[PDB]
């Protein structure tokens, strides 16, 4: 459980598929629910058990409660640290747009990556994780916009 960004992989009898990405911080693994469906993970020889999650937020944490507390400031540019299948991590800077909902505004990034990039962290300028990439919408021309999805550190 060393700090960093990780690929989430599945394999059966043949090769592996990258289904997503997540963040290890403070001994807890953080990813999107749709990546793991809330099931247990292997890390080397160890097992990581689901601890907290919420399907409406599309989030799940392993080993402990959600630790990522930084918030988008509602103003500044951010970076997606994209970890696409078969490619090394890369930083993409963008000025978020906004998902306007009946319950308030959520920052959203107009950046389009493969499905298995889900869970890649979005960063503020201090390198803090302000949310995870990959729960979004497809707009009229077929391009993609992802919410900056962040949980609550209780």
């Amino acid at each position: 459980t060393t700090d960093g960004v990780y690929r989430v992989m599945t394999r059966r009898l043949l090769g592996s598929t990258q289904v997503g990405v997540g963040v290890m911080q403070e001994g807890v693994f953080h990813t999107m629910w749709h990546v793991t469906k809330g099931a247990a993970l292997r890390s080397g020889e160890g097992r990581l058990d689901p601890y907290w999650g919420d399907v409406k937020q599309d989030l799940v944490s392993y080993c402990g409660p959600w630790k990522l507390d930084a918030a988008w400031d509602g103003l500044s540019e951010v970076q997606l640290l994209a970890v696409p299948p078969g490619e090394r991590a890369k930083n993409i800077q963008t000025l978020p747009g906004i998902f306007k909902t009946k319950d308030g505004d959520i920052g959203a990034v107009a950046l389009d990556y493969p499905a298995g990039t889900s869970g890649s962290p979005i960063l503020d300028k201090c390198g803090r994780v302000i949310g995870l990439y990959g729960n979004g919408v497809v707009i009229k021309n077929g391009s993609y916009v992802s919410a900056i999805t962040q949980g609550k550190r209780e």
Partner: protein
């Protein structure tokens, strides 16, 4: 199914990074299952 994790890098902001993408203003609904849909 063996679902497992593999380390892929450090989490660091990149100075002088490539900037891209617009800043769309979208009306969306979030359902109880976690689906976002355009209104």
């Amino acid at each position: 199914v063996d679902m497992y994790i593999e380390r892929a890098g450090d989490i660091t902001w990149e100075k002088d990074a490539e900037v891209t993408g617009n800043s769309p203003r979208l009306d969306v609904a979030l359902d109880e299952s976690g689906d976002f849909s355009l209104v």
